[PDB]
Amino acid sequence: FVESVDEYQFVERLLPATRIPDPPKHEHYPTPSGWQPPRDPPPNLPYFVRRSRMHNIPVYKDITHGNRQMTVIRKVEGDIWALQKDVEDFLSPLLGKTPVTQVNEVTGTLRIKGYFDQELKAWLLEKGF
Template structure:
């Protein structure tokens, strides 16, 4: 079924079916998508870092944690296993030296809870550390 046939069908609101020209319908559809509100990811967070943490510029670090492309969120996720009795935290989209990031995370998380997976460019943490990791990454400029 072509885009013009869908526009002429009764499934779309009359605002879409006003013109049968597929280009104008596509343009209206794209305009409506672009007008959606996107979340504002800028916020002020007061994070107290351990005294051993030095203020290192983000450009001098050997790793980078890329934000998501659409909404711009940090790729830190919680995961529950074993009937929600085992809590895990995942850090994804890591570029560069993953081992260095794991070593830096030892400042706020016990080292026995950190598992590095270089194949998937991710770090799995045993425990629910989502808020602490997001605050720590935000304080470091990611």
């Protein structure tokens, strides 16, 4: 009425994974999508900006009230005020005036007024974050 066989490997191909896997290497970065791993040994600046659980640069667009455009540089740790100096210097010649910043050294985060997400993603890339 029944027979017990062992070709269970296919079943084991269906069980998902919990841990994100460390992505595999490439002979020429960036990959076609745009990824670029974090430079090793780490860049020498006072601060650091960790990368997300699936390896992107933590710059995040944001909105409130339907007209407060904002950006958030999130997983900083170190002299965040150094990072405020850096980002203010970098953004000044783009807008035409210094950007209105808000630092939060408790959460280790920073934020800026006005959509600059892709600019800062590229900017933190070429510093080695």
